[PDB]
Amino acid sequence: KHSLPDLPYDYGALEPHINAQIMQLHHSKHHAAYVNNLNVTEEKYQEALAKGDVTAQIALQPALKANGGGHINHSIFWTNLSPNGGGEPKGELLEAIKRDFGSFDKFKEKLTAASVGVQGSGWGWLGFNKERGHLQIAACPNQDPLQGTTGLIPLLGIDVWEHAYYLQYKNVRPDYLKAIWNVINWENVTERYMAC
Amino acid sequence: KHSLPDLPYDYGALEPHINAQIMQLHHSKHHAAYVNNLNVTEEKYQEALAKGDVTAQIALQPALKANGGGHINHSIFWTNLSPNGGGEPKGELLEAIKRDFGSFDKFKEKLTAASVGVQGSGWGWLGFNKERGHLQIAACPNQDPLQGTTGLIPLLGIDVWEHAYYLQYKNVRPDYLKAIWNVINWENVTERYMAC
Amino acid sequence: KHSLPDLPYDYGALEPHINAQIMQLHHSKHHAAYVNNLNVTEEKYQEALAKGDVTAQIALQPALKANGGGHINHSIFWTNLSPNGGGEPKGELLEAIKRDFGSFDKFKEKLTAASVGVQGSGWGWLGFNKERGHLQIAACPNQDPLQGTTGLIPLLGIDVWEHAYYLQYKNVRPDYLKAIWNVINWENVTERYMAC
Amino acid sequence: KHSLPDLPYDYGALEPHINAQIMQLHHSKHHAAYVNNLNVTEEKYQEALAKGDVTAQIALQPALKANGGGHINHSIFWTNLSPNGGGEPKGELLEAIKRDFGSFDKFKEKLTAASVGVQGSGWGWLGFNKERGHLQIAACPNQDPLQGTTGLIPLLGIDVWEHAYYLQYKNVRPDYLKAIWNVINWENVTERYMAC
Ligand SMILES: [Mn+2]
Ligand SMILES: [Mn+2]
Ligand SMILES: [Mn+2]
Ligand SMILES: [Mn+2]
Known about the structure:
Chain A is mainly α.
């Protein structure tokens, strides 16, 4: 009941910031595997739940989180990028950013730092805290999804698993983060922000 | 669809090793809460699963593990104790213990050490590793169940959450562990061992 | 080089909200053990560090965190309580609370919820986020200290390990939390707040 | 006081199983960073320890584990590989493997499964359990070192962070694991085994 979403653009549309080979592998191999594994896991959980097998439900948690999170995270990621992206946001989002981070540049700095600081695999996120009513930066390990594990509503995510940049930027994660700002789809981030 | 099991003996049957007040609170308050919370959580999960809400499924994992594990762990614990317990096991179990731990006393020592070493709340377990075909000692945090999180089949469990001994032994966990050996139901442990 | 601090009041000074037996055990047994274990652990770390034994340094991390955190957490806790406490804070602290939580009652509600929600052993905290310049509520597991693990400056802490309330309130954690508000030393919380 | 070890062979010595570009980046960039970060972290810890700053000691734990583990893990990894490796072990090691895993092929299968199953970044290990006196397979997340976190003595490690294989094998981790068996230095694994 979960499917791989089509990319809203061509695999080479984000060049030269993110090359076509990475986009193709990331989408058709990595994301595809997560969706397929997610469907298999949910079916097993339905069976475990149906017979009240608590042990089986708990044993399946890691797989569900990794694959469920993998699907969620990448689905949002594709919409966060655009060949027509880059620049700075405008309107309320920009004001919210100035209000919570001081300036757009300080925000970029904070999110970049959080993303580069991830030890191992993970994601850097700009999220919305509905309880406090303000923007918040958070980093999640592996495929742990933002909302499901922290309660924050995801607005913008940056994948820092090595498969997201290694072929092009190798070990230099900072170079990858510097380039991704040129393809951020602020129109989508704004939409997500307005929704909450 | 999950219910609180009746105790196979009277609340004061384990005196003076574990007093009646602890047994009554442990069973009718602590275990009861876990069962009730477990049923509420599974119902929510059925709904989340039915509409493919992955975020909701992941957000419910901690509650399901804590309450599901709470029910599983305590259910086994009650069967591991008996007013007619104590002493040493016999037959194959005893041989398996001598074979994997050297002697019964060394086994007691190892399980005691693992149980007293738990920082915070948790359980000490004597489990069976089906893959290796031998006995194994493990400690689990909070209510994380043995089988669901490690794959080991539970044979004997020792609850070291403070509510399991504080009223009677206060901060002296070692005194609690020394006394519990007098009420271990080796007949039940043997049954669980033979089953796998 | 670490020592057990003397209590700023008599063990029975917080009656009837927290009885003397709990205060005596909590301070002279629980806190004392953490201090002694902390000193032993730091000495071992000095030796490991001196010979560049990285493996030994890493193996000692859990003990240092549990005992180091145990000492830190309880030291702050004793100063957070007072036989002359209770009521509501005043001045800037009160304003900060109204500003970040809406009202004092909503704040109490939020901190209570965070404290009762801890699965297993842990602490509920009212802390200060120096980066954002606002108050924040957080819950830490076992003895993990607030500042050392989250970066937040601790202002008020509530111990929810079962040994902190079981003898008097048994399994009813909510009753314990309701009573502790009568002995909060707002003068100390204010001091900690003004310092940062 | 920690230094980057020289590789016991040329960067292209493991071709075609592991290409020269990966070996060069892995050693001169990845491992080098860990060593440098480790030295900086230990110096900070010496200062924290000297003034009894427990908070600072705890805040530094993640960095020490990641960088300390990074150095330890890679140092062992380089010695586990050889242009003259491959094939099967002999002598006592082979017997121990047959005894604990059934056969060499079953062992390869078990270690491969553990390595491919790592979600995110991590390592697959063949270790020795001194307490039980037998071989054991374990998987560690990120740079968490084997001995420091599990107590097992490391004999053979397989790096499954994506930087260890992505440039050559892309997303196909199984292809990487199949190829690495051709360059395992069984002479070194045997030495480590005999030492314990
Ligand atoms: Mn990715
Ligand atoms: Mn219990
Ligand atoms: Mn305490
Ligand atoms: Mn590596």
